[PDB]
């Protein structure tokens, strides 16, 4: 089985974007869906949608890329340059509101799971609550 479904989804997105795939299917779960909502809201993906594989429900994440570049290696710039899970099973990371990181001095995001839902770094700072530091994306 999967020991960390959220990190598995993040790794699926990473490996899919690294080969410039169109979309990627992740085993569906409400937590993953609430995370993908933040992803699509911030613009790191074109969006997500529920689909069905042979018998089970999945989430198709439609990835996002930049324009094709010139010179050697015309592969476009990655929209998701870096996506890393932080609060892993076996070492869980909890942060207070004054302990929320500023990712890349504002250019990135940090997805938090707080008592008021799944938020971003600025969203949780504006709400004023902390929680489990799920991952960082920039």
Partner 1 sequence: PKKVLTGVVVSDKMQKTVTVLVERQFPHPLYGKVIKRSKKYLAHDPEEKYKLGDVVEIIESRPISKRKRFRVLRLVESGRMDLVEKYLIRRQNYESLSK
For RNA, the binding residues (CB under 7 A) are: 1-5, 27-32, 34, 55-57, 89-90, 92, 94-98, 113-118, 128-132
| Cα 109 to Cα 18: distance, rounded to the nearest angstrom | 20
Shortest CB 90 distance to partner 1, Å: 7
Helix H or strand E encompassing 12: helix 5-18
Shortest CB 62 distance to RNA, Å: 21
Q: Which of residues 59-118 bind partner 1 (CB under 8 A)?
A: 90-94
21 within 8 A of 35, measured Cβ to Cβ: no
Q: Which is nearer to RNA, 69 or 93 (CB)?
A: 93
Q: 59-73 b/e with 16+ CB inside 10 Å = b?
A: bbbebbbeeeeeeee
Q: Which is nearer to partner 1, 71 or 90 (CB)?
A: 90
The binding site for partner 1 (CB under 8 A) comprises: 90-94
């Amino acid at each position: 089985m999967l020991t960390d479904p959220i990190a598995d989804m993040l790794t699926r997105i990473r490996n899919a974007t690294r080969v410039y795939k169109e979309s990627t299917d992740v085993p569906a779960s409400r937590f993953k869906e609430e995370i993908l909502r933040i992803l699509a809201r911030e613009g790191f993906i074109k969006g997500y949608e529920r689909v069905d594989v042979d018998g089970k429900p999945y989430l198709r994440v439609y990835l996002k890329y930049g324009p094709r570049r010139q010179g050697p290696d015309p592969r476009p710039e990655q929209v998701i340059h870096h996506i890393r899970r932080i609060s892993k099973p076996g070492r869980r990371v909890y942060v207070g509101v004054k302990e929320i990181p500023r990712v890349r001095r504002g250019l990135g995001i940090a997805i938090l799971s707080t008592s008021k839902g799944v938020l971003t770094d600025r969203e949780a700072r504006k709400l004023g609550v902390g929680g489990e530091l799920i991952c960082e994306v920039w």
